[PDB]
Amino acid sequence: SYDSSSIKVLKGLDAVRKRPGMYIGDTDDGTGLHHMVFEVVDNAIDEALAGHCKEIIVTIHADNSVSVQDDGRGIPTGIHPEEGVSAAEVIMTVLHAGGKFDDNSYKVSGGLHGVGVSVVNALSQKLELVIQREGKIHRQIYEHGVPQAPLAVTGETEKTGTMVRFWPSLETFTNVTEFEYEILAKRLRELSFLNSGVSIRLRDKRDGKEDHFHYEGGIKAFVEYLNKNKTPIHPNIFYFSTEKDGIGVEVALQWNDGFQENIYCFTNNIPQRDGGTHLAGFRAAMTRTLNAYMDKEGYSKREGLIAVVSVKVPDPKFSSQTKDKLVSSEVKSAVEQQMNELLAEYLLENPTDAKIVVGKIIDAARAREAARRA
Amino acid sequence: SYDSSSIKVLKGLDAVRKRPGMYIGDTDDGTGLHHMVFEVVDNAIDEALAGHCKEIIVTIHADNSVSVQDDGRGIPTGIHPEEGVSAAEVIMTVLHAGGKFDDNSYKVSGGLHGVGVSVVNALSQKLELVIQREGKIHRQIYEHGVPQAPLAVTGETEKTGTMVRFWPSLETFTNVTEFEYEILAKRLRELSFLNSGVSIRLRDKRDGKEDHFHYEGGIKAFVEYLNKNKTPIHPNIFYFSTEKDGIGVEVALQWNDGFQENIYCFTNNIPQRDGGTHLAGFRAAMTRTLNAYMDKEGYSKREGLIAVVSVKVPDPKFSSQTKDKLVSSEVKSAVEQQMNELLAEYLLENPTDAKIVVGKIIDAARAREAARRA
Ligand SMILES: Nc1ncnc2c1ncn2[C@@H]1O[C@H](COP(=O)(O)OP(=O)(O)O)[C@@H](O)[C@H]1O
Ligand SMILES: Nc1ncnc2c1ncn2[C@@H]1O[C@H](COP(=O)(O)OP(=O)(O)O)[C@@H](O)[C@H]1O
Ligand code: BEF
Ligand code: BEF
Ligand SMILES: [Mg+2]
Ligand SMILES: [Mg+2]
Known part of the structure; x- marks a missing residue:
């Protein structure tokens, strides 16, 4: 009635879906739903802290998704040894995986747990990842944290950047399912004061409404x-x-x-x-x-x-x-x-x-x- | 200067040692140090919630360790399929592993993340596990979360129970390194009111001081x-x-x-x-x-x-x-x-x-x- 068969192990991102409270917070009152954006914004702001990102654009789309575009260095794309897939995927599908565990990539960063965007991927019915790095544009698509295809070159560019767009899973967030302009805006306003010389753009495609934060x-x-x-x-x-x-x-x-x-x-x-x-x-x-x-x-x-x-x-x-x-x-x-x-x-x-x-x-x-x- | 080699993955309990704040809390002010005990106490209290545990004994030892004895069902001992080791070890060395992910073993429990005692093992320079189940006494020893030997039968008994004793790692907790009677006592007092008909004993071997909580x-x-x-x-x-x-x-x-x-x-x-x-x-x-x-x-x-x-x-x-x-x-x-x-x-x-x-x-x-x- 209670033995070794009773003991289950949650693998990959399943534990995040099973216990979102642990990782994203309140799934009902809107705070975790907005925190999905912030996790992504913070990773951009971290490229900025390191001196590699001077523009961030956050876009509220008309289909209830949100995107965050940065002109940072771009999430790494090459094959991860050990894990046997692109480094980008490892960060999207593995917990406690990242480059803020030491000081070699960000002397100083908000991030430190190796989890955030992993969490977002997991609580998102869809995620889109567009990486501009090493001359190539790379792209991948996930559904409930699952890569529908390896990461792939789809063009050439000089630019450097990461773009993430996610559509929250409703099988997780409840009551407050819609993004609120003012909540995103208040935090990005504050970010601009904390990050001088970085342009932070907030776009709402539901009503054409726009902000550009760049206080000096x-x-x-x-x-x-x-x-x-x-x-x-x-x-x-x-x-x-x-x-x-x-x-x-x-x-x-x-x-x-x-x-x-x-x-x-x-x-x-x-x-x-x-x-x-x-x-x-x-x-x-x-x-x-x-x-x-x-x-x-x-x-x-x-x-x-x-x-x-x-x-x-x-x-x-x-x-x-x-x-x-x-x-x-x-x-x-x-x-x-x-x-x-x-x-x-x-x-x-x-x-x-x-x-x-x-x-x-x-x-x-x-x-x-x-x-x-x- | 920042590529796929830059992205490290933390395996097993390493992420807990790396980021204890995430899992145990403040490692400096005593609150996480005391929370090490509570995690263990809560797992016992959970055996009680399910109707299988009527005595808990928590003992502050003279060597700065603390133990928690319960007459519950005992952590499962048999080999875990998939993981290929005793179920007991899986719970001590794996994150998001347990039997409160569904309702088949505890209709209702404090636990739900599958992590707590995993955390304790990881932040403990030594841990001792003594399981009384299925007629046999089983035992194992860990050091900084590492099993020095598989789980082994070392006697026969009718009793049922789990005993965990841990010696916190000082490479993690600081300033407040010593256990405080009153902090443990206040929480166990309250537990006895919340758990009628369960005897909760608190022992301090530093000074012979003792408590028995069993309010009705x-x-x-x-x-x-x-x-x-x-x-x-x-x-x-x-x-x-x-x-x-x-x-x-x-x-x-x-x-x-x-x-x-x-x-x-x-x-x-x-x-x-x-x-x-x-x-x-x-x-x-x-x-x-x-x-x-x-x-x-x-x-x-x-x-x-x-x-x-x-x-x-x-x-x-x-x-x-x-x-x-x-x-x-x-x-x-x-x-x-x-x-x-x-x-x-x-x-x-x-x-x-x-x-x-x-x-x-x-x-x-x-x-x-x-x-x-x-
Ligand atoms: N916009 C970005 N640009 C460059 N690197 C990123 C970006 N977002 C995430 N990363 C990489 O992904 C890693 C893991 O991301 P995340 O799971 O959010 O955790 P963390 O920031 O806790 O390490 C980051 O540490 C960083 O190396
Ligand atoms: N004293 C105990 N008696 C019986 N089972 C226990 C005991 N302590 C832990 N367990 C088992 O270990 C599992 C995992 O423990 P823990 O890591 O503390 O997480 P959780 O309680 O979050 O599941 C528990 O769910 C339970 O099945
Ligand atoms: F963004 Be990481 F999870 F700290
Ligand atoms: F005790 Be478990 F981690 F909720
Ligand atoms: Mg992050
Ligand atoms: Mg527990």
């Missing part, structure tokens, strides 16, 4: 754009970009007169909705740097803050498969030391801003303490 | 125990257990005079720190049932609530690999319909409690509205 101001202008609708209470955005002890740290921030706290963290451009070591360094330096400034300015002894903290780390570790929280320990200490040094400078060189920020922080403690009215 | 009152008494230190403002805990349309729903709750909101959700006994469809049904029924009761009692038109919502579902879907959030859509609607029917009854049959709970909820809106003092 980097995460500085990201901050401005986030304070676009609240009122910044001080004119000088704190900003820096450093790269020390193998870690890239880049921070921008600026306070408005509202009451929210919005600190957007990123590791190799992937968002951490739940923070992690980089957030924690950010807060420890904020609090230490601030309190010294008060002590010095003779004061005795969060709200309105918008900030972007973006780090570049060679081999990050997350807490989970969603990359929602960064754990690489050495990153707390890197953001800490850097903020402490430069925020401290910032306050000296901008004493007018300083006093205003601290004046807001004081004002808020005064408000709550004026509910000693019991 | 089920999730009802779980609630009492959570209100043990705050003041319950009403004597009758709302409770029910139903199983309808293939879904088990069990809820207990009770309000105290504090201001926190603590609603503990579970699916096949796994915690959802971030809620999901079961939480959402719980809140929608709470609010609908409450508002009808006010309307009826002539009132015009969260805080202090402690509740446990535990569901039993055959094939759950989570949003992520951590099982932190449940997405199985049909579960919103099941908890909704059941709460609505029975909470409504509860308020009728206990009008004294009713008025008190609603009186607290009114009191809180009165307090905040008395900060119209601007």
Whole structure:
């Protein structure tokens, strides 16, 4: 009734179809459905991080599919030894297969699990792959993760690029089956701030609607754009970009007169909705740097803050498969030391801003303490 | 400089060692280190869910290892066809391999990915496996996930059981390398409330300290125990257990005079720190049932609530690999319909409690509205 016959092994992409939650996320509320695009976008953005991709075009087609065109190096096409098929297919049909397991192809990348586009192939009733590399145009087609034919040359070109178009399987995603412009747009807008000098085009063929994102101001202008609708209470955005002890740290921030706290963290451009070591360094330096400034300015002894903290780390570790929280320990200490040094400078060189920020922080403690009215 | 040679495939458990974050979680803060135990405990608890395990003993050894003994059916020992080795080894060395992919061995289980104890084997410098099944005692030993010898009979017994002891690899976990009594204890305490009639023993061989958890009152008494230190403002805990349309729903709750909101959700006994469809049904029924009761009692038109919502579902879907959030859509609607029917009854049959709970909820809106003092 329960023995060795009871124990089944899932091969290839079957485990992804069997358990999409593990790999793509919520298959019902639209978040996994949109994450199918992002997985593909992130692989492009990774070509960009490495200096090989300056244009990305994401297209929402009229048949419910979505495509992502990059002018990167193109997924490798030659025969994989060991696996005995094109390298391109190995990456589409094998889990834990890729070139971000070391640092030889992307010094730094979002990807690291060797799975993402594998997942997309598996949860897609159809996938189309068009590779421009080594002078040749190569192409292949899959259905529910199955190659209907080996990868084949179908022309000649000088261009370099990868194009992936997928039609999600409805045998997996439910309720939210249609792609939403604004969800894709918000993430690509943010990508353009994180990737200066890369053109990111968003096309919707359902209604002719279009976007071209290519802001220049980097995460500085990201901050401005986030304070676009609240009122910044001080004119000088704190900003820096450093790269020390193998870690890239880049921070921008600026306070408005509202009451929210919005600190957007990123590791190799992937968002951490739940923070992690980089957030924690950010807060420890904020609090230490601030309190010294008060002590010095003779004061005795969060709200309105918008900030972007973006780090570049060679081999990050997350807490989970969603990359929602960064754990690489050495990153707390890197953001800490850097903020402490430069925020401290910032306050000296901008004493007018300083006093205003601290004046807001004081004002808020005064408000709550004026509910000693019991 | 970047071609087919650039694309590496990780085989067996190497991908777990390479990316533990994906599979075990934070390797630095102790949470993944403790999750190594829980993975093993959950597999035992699963034997219990199926009616085959009435005792679990978890032992913290003096050499930094931990063991988990169950009187379940024992992991299968016979040769696996296809894989050509004992079924036991397949489960220890293969990803996406197990018997919770269908419903033939566990109608309902925490496990579903076919990975957990595989992960533990991989992140353990040593593992020991002792299986009591089919009259024979079987045993095997691994090192960094590698079987030092096939699985072997080493005695005869009538007993049935599985014993796993592991010594975490320090080449993976950092900072927090030592097991903490209280973390294991808190989860096993809770397990005993969720699993009535199962004895769960916790042993620490570092200091002779011991616990035996075997509460009888089920999730009802779980609630009492959570209100043990705050003041319950009403004597009758709302409770029910139903199983309808293939879904088990069990809820207990009770309000105290504090201001926190603590609603503990579970699916096949796994915690959802971030809620999901079961939480959402719980809140929608709470609010609908409450508002009808006010309307009826002539009132015009969260805080202090402690509740446990535990569901039993055959094939759950989570949003992520951590099982932190449940997405199985049909579960919103099941908890909704059941709460609505029975909470409504509860308020009728206990009008004294009713008025008190609603009186607290009114009191809180009165307090905040008395900060119209601007
Ligand atoms: N647009 C692209 N251009 C070049 N290489 C790509 C592209 N997309 C995917 N790849 C290759 O495929 C590999 C595996 O892809 P994926 O499964 O998404 O996982 P990962 O990015 O986790 O390694 C990548 O590491 C990269 O080497
Ligand atoms: N204590 C146990 N008793 C009986 N069977 C077990 C035990 N632990 C593990 N197993 C078997 O091993 C399988 C795979 O284990 P695991 O890798 O933890 O994944 P899962 O529980 O996700 O299937 C289980 O599904 C179950 O069939
Ligand atoms: F994109 Be990989 F799976 F990190
Ligand atoms: F325990 Be299994 F990996 F869900
Ligand atoms: Mg990727
Ligand atoms: Mg398991």
